[PDB]
Structures are given as structure tokens and as C-alpha cells.
């Protein structure tokens, strides 16, 4: 869809394509976090530290519970197509309607959670499942260290150690709970997603994306000191005929001035569609981008025509900083503005001259065996695959002040035109 | 002031109003933080850890002291209206003049602080006041645990524990001191504002705002290892005849295209004033917004007239992303662009058709008992309170490139007009 060859002549470089994997559906699993560990010691040791630790957790559990309880409600309360509920008074956007429908879907789950928590209260396992998974904050450290310490050291000796261990956990909890992403909880409990949920070899990119999806707090229990979250696990599917391209613009020469074509960082082609992509929220893998939804957006017709090979329509702006590159390697050759950048062919002993009417010089292995950029001699790649007077008239400005100054000039010319019309009507 | 009813026809939705509480005045109280705890043990235990801890605090106390000492001075040194001081050479903006006047007001307080610190050096209380309040970093943990450990365990055993406890406190200090907000200090010392200052049942929103106000370091003592801050406690007052409204724009249909009215997230009405509000720095309560100063700002006359009911002046822009909602619940009914969104009345069995000349469909309980959005059947609210050919000509673009491309077209038309004038003057 993109004329990669012609764009090089205007300094627009298109990188290697990558497909797209989109999260069409999500598996929903509930994670219960129990913040109070169980000290199995029959001598009731550590109870004083746990009492103090409870007082410290309140600084987090109470704010969360208050925020949830006072959250506005947009739907108030079967068949495959029955009415979900009644529209609550107020204004609710599509995002709030979708989020509320998700909370309604969890109504049946909440009734189950209330029964499972009773068994979590007296269990001493670090990670337990009945899927619904429950993790105790420090139970693993307690069982492996604090439990055997009581049999060897005094209760006082390792009682203080339990205090410091719990204090560290509070510092981590307040870091993540003080939105929430699954990576935060996974790091807090130092446990992998594959160890938490036994559901399905997948690439590191897929796990990194799963750890990036947000989690929402469905309820908080002030009596058992437990917090439960809804975790969404994505089902990635490759979107056929979808390509994401990276666009890099180099400096372009026009009458000894430096210009560049302003384009989005990433552009996408999907069948007949051509436009930018907001990959800032996506994960980039070796061969595809993993996104939660289609990142495409509609571009200006001049940019869409520019990328379709009509390079005379490409917008151009003056280069005002050193951020814009002046040379780049392309398919085994060098593409650079050889006027402001010293380009040498087959050695530094000779400089290739770029005529003032040419904006970008394309150097290929068929011409120069070695290319030197600012003295950096490089060997061309033999496997690389890298006379038209192109003129670009769509000059554009990226700042509102420049446009305003130009608009004031246009308004002044309009006044002169109106005055000349008045003069013509009066004299004629 | 706002014609909420007419704005719905253009897709502009105004949410439930909230008043405004503004901080007209502030109470000033000084907080002294003493970083070195006092170990009451007569055997001088823990002294080695304290010596090491002092060396670690220098990495924070010295940078702060150097920054304060080298800070530029804009005022150099009674009666109810005497001269504050002499203007120092240089340039000082209003913010710096105000901040400097605040430091001058603390001159008398600093003279008092220098005498109070002497008593703080030998006291062993965690929180003490003489108001001026002083808090010792770990004195509470030392008295409740490290002091009784010496009587039971050896000095070596719990000496190492004191080291780890102090090390944790340093990691927290460098997190907040490495501006500063009172919430940070409150979290660092795990103490509530009501426990620190005994001054006045107030709502959680008021305390959350008090914890949001910034605190400034007035002085640092390198000998006693103490830092003192000036804390401002706000006196909230309800600003009568002040309302803040939330504005949500949905997609609007024009000849099968999707348009939306770009408006600020929040708009304010204050007597005769109508304009946007920068609530990003404010706290949102159940019935009012708590702000440090009036967040209002002047809007463009076209937006001010649009919100005043002259919907023909509303600016409109093309929808270029899925962020803009396409349906929203309003006062118990559904307001949606039923062309791109499937709207069903009294069941999915029939779709309501929206004529191409109508931009937004308003569905009320008086017409459809149940409304289905993309198959999501919802029951209308019986208590809800939800034929004009409106045309919007003020088309606007939100990006500088589009405006530049349109401006180039206008300039080309100006050149053609000037040429036609030249031709007319030459021929006639």
C-alpha cells in the first residue's frame, strides 16, 4: 500500500513491517489477597506484631473501602437476552456503562467469594485455589523461617524479625495500592502468572502483555483483612492483513535550507485503510505488536496521499533542532542529506557533491563500495536491495504562533483586497 | 446559565453540578522532624548503628542545606503598615515576591524554634509539642521494642535489628526528600494529621485536601540532625453562587460523518461568568470541589455562546478515534448516535431509524420502555426527566497541520484574487 521506494527521495523511511495481535476476548479469574498471615505457633508468638501490623494496614484498606463504597452507581438491579437492569439517574458515558456491566457480571462471583473466604481464614498455605486463587502476604516466609525459629530461638528474638518483615511488606503494598496493573501484584508477591493460575510455552511478549492489563478491585473485607481483584487474561489472535510500519523522517534539503516531512511515529495498513497507529499503549514483539484494541486513527488526506506515492503532497516543515536525523542506513546503503553531512565515496579522499536542487542523496552498493559519514567509514552490504525534479508546495508549521502570524498576513491582504474592491466599485 | 436541554441535541451533556470550596486563608503551624532517635539504654547500646546512620543521613541533609543556603534572596532586611524590606537587585516575579514575604513572616518563628530544639535534643517522646510539634523518626519503635530487648536479649542481638529498622527509614526519607506534600510526611511517620496537630468531624475530603497542600523547608540543622517545615492548614469556605459542571461530548452525525463538539472537561458558572475550570489540581468531594484558588478561565466567545444555548455557534471537529463515546445515559434515558450505534426500542426486534439530517437521537421513557444499545437491553427509569433543523458551520481543527494546509489553500485563493484584481485594473 505504501510506496517505500519513492518516500526515500523525500527522506521518509519505512522500517520492517510487523503484524498485529489483538485481544478479542478475555478470560476472567478472581484473585483474593489475604494480608494477615497465620502464625501456626501454639504459644501465640508474633500476635503482638500482627496486632500492630493490622493497625498499619488500616491506612490502606480503609481508604480503598471508602472509595469503593462511595463510588457512583449507574445501573441498579433470567434469559439469554433479558434486561440487564435499570438506567440510574445522572449522566453515564459508554466507558462507565461498559465498566458497570462488568461489575454486574461479577454479581454471581461475589456470592461464591463470600463462601470461599471462610476456608482461607484458617488455612496456612501460601498459594491456594479451590478457578479462584488466594495468596497470603508472608505465609511462605513465616512457614519456612519464622515457624522453625520459635523452636530454636526465643519468641522475642524472632518476634522482632517478623515485625521488620511485615513492615517491608507494608512499604511494598503502599507503593502499588497507595490504576493497578497485574505486574505490580506479581512483583509484590514475587510469583509468576503461570504459578498463580494453572491455565493455558507462550512467548515472553505474551506474558509481558498479560502483566500489563489492568485489574479492578471488586470488594474489600474489613473483618478478614482481605482484598480481591478481577484479573483478565487475554486471548490473543493475529489480525490478518494488518501491518504496522515505523516511519523515520530525515532532513531534506531545499535551496540550502533543511526541511523534514512530519509524520506519525507509526503508520498502519489494514486492507484499504492507511493511517497512524498509537502503539504507545501496545507491546512490541519480535514479529507482531500486541494491542488491547485497534490503535489505528485517520490521517489527513495530504499525509495519506503522500504515503500512497504522491510525494508532491507531503507536508514539510523547517528543521529547528538536532533531534531530526541527517543520515540513516537503509537496506544496506546510506540515505543522507549530503550537503550538511559530509558524504564520501570509496574513501574520505573524495566528497560526493549534491546539487542544490536535490534534497536527499541515495548511495547504494552498486556505486560506492565504502561510504563515510563524517569520517565514519562503513562497508556496504552486498545483499542490500536499496532524476525526477520533485517539488513540495505544502509548507506547514507545527506551532500555533507561526500559523497566527501567517494568518494575520492573510487577513491584512484580505483587507487590501476588500479596499481595492471598494475603490473599483466607487470609481467604476 | 447553561441550556442543558438544547446542548443534548448537539451531543453536549452536562452532568450534575457541584459547588466549590476555596481556601481563602491558611493557618500556619511548624513541624520539626528529628531524624536521630534517643536510645535510653545506659549501656550505650546501638551507638554504633546510630553513628553509621548519621553518615547515611548526610547524603540527604547536606544537599538540602546546600540548596537552601545558596537559594537566591529577593528581599533584604514595627508598624501595622511599615516597609517589609528593601528590593534586592535582580528580577523577581510575583510568585517569588509572595514566597519571600512568607519567609519574612517566619523570621519571628525561627527565633522561637532555635530555643525549642534544645529541649527536643534530650527528650524521648515520639510526638511532643510545646503550636510547634516535634516528631522523632523511630522513637516509638525504639521505646516499645529496642528498649525492652536490651533487658532480655544481648546488645548485639537487637543491635543489628535497630540497624535494619533505621535502614528502612532512610529508604523512606530518600523517597520523599530525594515539591514536598504533607501526605508524604504523614505517610513517612505513619501518623494522622489529627494526631499531629490538636486543632480544629471534618469530612475525609477535607483531610485529603489538607494532606495535598505543599510544605516548605524553612531551615535545616546539621548539628542536631533535624529538619523543620512550615505546614499550612486551610480554612475552607463555600463560594456562594459558584457551580462546576462536567461536560461530556458524544459523537454527532452530519451526512453519515461523525463529528463532536470539543469542550473543556469541566465548565464553571459564577454569577455572570461562564468558563472552563482547571479541576486537575482540586479535590472532588460528594457535593463540592475543594480548590486552592479559583480554577476558572476565560473561554472563546463561540464556546461561551454555544453553552448559552446558541447551539449554531458550537465548534465541531471530526471524530478520529474510539475514545469519543457514541452513546450515554442521560436522566434515565439514552442519548446516542443511532446511525453508527444500533438502537432498539421495546426489544431488539426493531431498530429505530435516524434520518441523515438528525445528528443525535434522544430516547425517553415516554416512548421506549426498554432501550437496547448493541444488544444491551436496559430498563428505562420512570422517574427520569429527559424537530429543529440545527446547522453548525463553525468547523474547527485541533491539530496545527490541518490548519496550515487550510491556510495554504486560503493563501493560494488570495493570490488568485490579487491576480484577478491586477487583470481587472490592467484591462479596465
Amino acid at each position, epitope marked *: *500500500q505504501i*510506496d517505500i521506494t519513492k518516500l526515500q527521495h523525500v527522506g521518509v523511511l519505512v522500517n520492517s513491517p510487523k503484524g498485529m495481535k489483538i485481544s478479542q476476548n478475555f478470560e476472567t479469574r478472581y484473585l483474593i489477597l489475604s494480608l494477615i498471615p497465620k502464625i501456626e505457633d501454639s504459644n501465640s508468638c508474633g500476635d503482638q506484631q500482627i496486632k500492630q501490623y493490622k493497625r498499619l494496614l488500616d491506612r490502606l484498606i480503609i481508604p480503598l473501602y471508602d472509595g469503593l463504597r462511595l463510588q457512583k452507581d449507574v445501573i441498579v438491579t433470567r434469559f439469554f437476552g433479558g434486561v440487564i437492569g435499570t438506567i440510574a439517574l445522572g449522566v453515564a458515558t459508554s466507558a462507565q456503562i461498559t465498566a458497570a456491566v462488568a461489575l454486574v457480571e461479577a454479581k454471581q462471583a461475589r456470592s461464591d467469594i463470600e463462601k470461599l473466604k471462610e476456608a482461607i481464614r484458617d488455612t496456612n498455605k501460601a498459594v491456594q485455589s479451590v478457578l479462584i486463587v488466594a495468596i497470603k502476604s508472608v505465609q511462605d516466609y513465616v512457614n519456612k523461617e519464622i515457624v522453625p525459629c520459635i523452636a530454636r530461638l526465643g519468641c522475642e528474638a524472632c518476634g522482632l524479625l517478623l515485625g521488620l518483615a511485615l513492615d517491608q511488606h507494608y512499604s511494598e503494598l503502599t507503593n502499588i495500592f497507595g490504576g493497578i496493573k497485574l505486574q505490580g501484584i506479581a512483583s509484590l508477591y514475587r510469583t509468576n502468572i503461570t504459578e498463580i493460575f494453572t491455565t493455558s510455552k507462550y512467548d515472553i511478549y505474551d506474558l509481558l502483555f498479560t502483566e500489563s492489563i489492568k485489574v479492578r478491585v471488586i470488594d474489600v473485607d474489613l473483618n478478614d483483612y482481605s482484598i480481591t481483584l478481577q484479573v483478565r487474561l487475554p486471548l490473543l489472535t493475529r489480525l490478518l*492483513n494488518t501491518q504496522i510500519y515505523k516511519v523515520d523522517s530525515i532532513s531534506y534539503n531545499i535551496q540550502n535550507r533543511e526541511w523534514y516531512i512530519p509524520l506519525p511515529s507509526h503508520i498502519m495498513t*489494514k*486492507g*484499504a*485503510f*492507511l*493511517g497512524g497507529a498509537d502503539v504507545k499503549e501496545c507491546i512490541e514483539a519480535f514479529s507482531s505488536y500486541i494491542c488491547p484494541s*485497534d490503535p*489505528g*486513527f*485517520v490521517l489527513n*488526506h*495530504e499525509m*495519506e*496521499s503522500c504515503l*500512497s*506515492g*504522491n510525494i508532491s*503532497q507531503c507536508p514539510r516543515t523547517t528543521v529547528t533542532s538536532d533531534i531530526v536525523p541527517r543520515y540513516a542506513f537503509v537496506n544496506g546503503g546510506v540515505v543522507a542529506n549530503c550537503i550538511t553531512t559530509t558524504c564520501t565515496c570509496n574513501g574520505i579522499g573524495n566528497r560526493i557533491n549534491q546539487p542544490p536542487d536535490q534534497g536527499v542523496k541515495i548511495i547504494t552498493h552498486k556505486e560506492c563500495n565504502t561510504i563515510g559519514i563524517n569520517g565514519m567509514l562503513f562497508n556496504t552490504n552486498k545483499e542490500g536491495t536499496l532524476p525526477d525534479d520533485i517539488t513540495l508546495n505544502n509548507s506547514v508549521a507545527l506551532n500555533p504562533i507561526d500559523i497566527s502570524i501567517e494568518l494575520n498576513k492573510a487577513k491584512s491582504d484580505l483587507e487590501e483586497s476588500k479596499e481595492w474592491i471598494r475603490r473599483s466599485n466607487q470609481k467604476l | 446559565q447553561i441550556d442543558i436541554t438544547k446542548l443534548q441535541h448537539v451531543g453536549v451533556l452536562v452532568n450534575s453540578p457541584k459547588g466549590m470550596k476555596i481556601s481563602q486563608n491558611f493557618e500556619t503551624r511548624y513541624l520539626i522532624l528529628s531524624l536521630i532517635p534517643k536510645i535510653e539504654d545506659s549501656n550505650s547500646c546501638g551507638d554504633q548503628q546510630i553513628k553509621q546512620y548519621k553518615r547515611l543521613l548526610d547524603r540527604l541533609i547536606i544537599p538540602l542545606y546546600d540548596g537552601l543556603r545558596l537559594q537566591k534572596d529577593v528581599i533584604v532586611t514595627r508598624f501595622f503598615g511599615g516597609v517589609i524590606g528593601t528590593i534586592a537587585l535582580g528580577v523577581a516575579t510575583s510568585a517569588q515576591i509572595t514566597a519571600a514575604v512568607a519567609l519574612v513572616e517566619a523570621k519571628q518563628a525561627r527565633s522561637d524554634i532555635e530555643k525549642l530544639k534544645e529541649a527536643i535534643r534530650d527528650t524521648n517522646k515520639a510526638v511532643q509539642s510545646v503550636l510547634i510539634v516535634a516528631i522523632k523518626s523511630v522513637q516509638d519503635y525504639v521505646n516499645k521494642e529496642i528498649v525492652p530487648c536490651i533487658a532480655r536479649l544481648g546488645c548485639e542481638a537487637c543491635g543489628l535489628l535497630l540497624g535494619l529498622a533505621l535502614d528502612q527509614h532512610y529508604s523512606e526519607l530518600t523517597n520523599i526528600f530525594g515539591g514536598i506534600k504533607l501526605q508524604g510526611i504523614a505517610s513517612l511517620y505513619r501518623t494522622n494529621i489529627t494526631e499531629i496537630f490538636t486543632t480544629s468531624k471534618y469530612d475525609i475530603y477535607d483531610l485529603l485536601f489538607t494532606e495535598s497542600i505543599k510544605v516548605r523547608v524553612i531551615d535545616v540543622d546539621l548539628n542536631d540532625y533535624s529538619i523543620t517545615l512550615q505546614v499550612r492548614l486551610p480554612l475552607l469556605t463555600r463560594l456562594l453562587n459558584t457551580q462546576i459542571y462536567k461536560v461530556d461530548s458524544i459523537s454527532y452525525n452530519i*451526512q*453519515n*460523518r*461523525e463529528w463532536y463538539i470539543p469542550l473543556p472537561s469541566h465548565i464553571m458558572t459564577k454569577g455572570a461568568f461562564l468558563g472552563g475550570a482547571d479541576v486537575k489540581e482540586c479535590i472532588e468531594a460528594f457535593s463540592s470541589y475543594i480548590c486552592p484558588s479559583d480554577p476558572g478561565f476565560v473561554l472563546n466567545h463561540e464556546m461561551e455562546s454555544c453553552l448559552s444555548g446558541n447551539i449554531s455557534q458550537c465548534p465541531r471537529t471530526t471524530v478520529t478515534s*474510539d475514545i469519543v463515546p457514541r452513546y450515554a445515559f442521560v436522566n434515565g434515558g439514552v442519548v446516542a448516535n443511532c*446511525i*453508527t450505534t444500533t438502537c432498539t426500542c421495546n426489544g431488539i426486534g426493531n431498530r429505530i431509524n435516524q434520518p441523515p439530517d438528525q445528528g443525535v437521537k434522544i430516547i425517553t421513557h415516554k416512548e421506549c420502555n426498554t432501550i437496547g444499545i448493541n444488544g444491551m437491553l436496559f430498563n428505562t427509569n420512570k422517574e427520569g426527566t429527559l424537530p429543529d433543523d440545527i446547522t453548525l458551520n463553525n468547523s474547527v481543527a485541533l491539530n496545527p497541520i490541518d490548519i496550515s494546509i487550510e491556510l495554504n489553500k486560503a493563501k493560494s485563493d488570495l493570490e488568485e484574487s490579487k491576480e484577478w484584481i491586477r487583470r481587472s485594473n490592467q484591462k479596465l
Partner: nanobody, 115 residues
Framework: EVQLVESGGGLVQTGDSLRLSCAASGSIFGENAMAWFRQAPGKQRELVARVSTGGTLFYADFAKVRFTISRDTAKQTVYLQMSSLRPEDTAVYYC?????????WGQGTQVTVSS
């Protein structure tokens, strides 16, 4: 929501010409991007030609001069006149139309360049 119909395929002799057509009806209005794709049996799908929103034409290496593409905005119809066919052109041709960010695909007609 937008219905895409394409016609003009079928058997054709080597060296002859064909004119594929594809029309759109429904909520589609104004200038829109239209494209024609191709997919040989046992081969990945490839683009033949495309008409951008502003009318800028694009052609693949195999369609640089042999094929021509045109758009009729008043009828929302895209035409692909294959002036010179070769036996390797035998494949399924798919019509594609883009309305904003949404891409709609049609039921691809089959063209067999017999010999």
C-alpha cells in the same frame, strides 16, 4: 452494515481483457478509500491496486501498466480493468472498502486465465 458486491469475474482466455467491478451501499457516503486484493490458491493474499481518499492511485509491481483502477464516488463503485492477462493471474480477487478506521471485505470473485 455496509454491503459489498462484486461482479465481472469468471473464465477468460489468455491475452484477453476483463473489467471487475465492486459497488457499496448503505451508510457509505462521500469519498472513501477502495482497494482490490488478490490471493492465489495456496499463496498469501497480496494487493493489486488501491485508490486513496484523495484519488491518488497506487499499483503493485505486477499491475504497474497491465491493470488500471478507477473510482466513481457518485455510485461508490470501484473498477479494475485488467487490460492484459497472463496465466499466472489466475486467482481470487477481493474488493476492499475503508470507511474511517473500519475495513469491509467482499465475497471475492474468481478469475481463471484459461489457455
Amino acid at each position: 452494515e455496509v454491503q459489498l458486491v462484486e461482479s465481472g469475474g469468471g473464465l477468460v482466455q489468455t491475452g484477453d481483457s476483463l473489467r471487475l467491478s465492486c459497488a457499496a451501499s448503505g451508510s457509505i457516503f462521500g469519498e472513501n478509500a477502495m482497494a482490490w486484493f488478490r490471493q492465489a490458491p495456496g499463496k498469501q493474499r497480496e494487493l493489486v491496486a488501491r485508490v486513496s481518499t484523495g484519488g491518488t492511485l497506487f499499483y503493485a509491481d505486477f499491475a504497474k501498466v497491465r491493470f488500471t483502477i478507477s473510482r466513481d464516488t457518485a455510485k461508490q463503485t470501484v473498477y479494475l480493468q485488467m487490460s492484459s492477462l497472463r496465466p499466472e493471474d489466475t486467482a481470487v480477487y477481493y474488493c476492499a472498502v475503508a470507511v474511517g478506521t473500519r475495513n469491509y471485505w467482499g465475497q471475492g470473485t474468481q478469475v481463471t486465465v484459461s489457455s
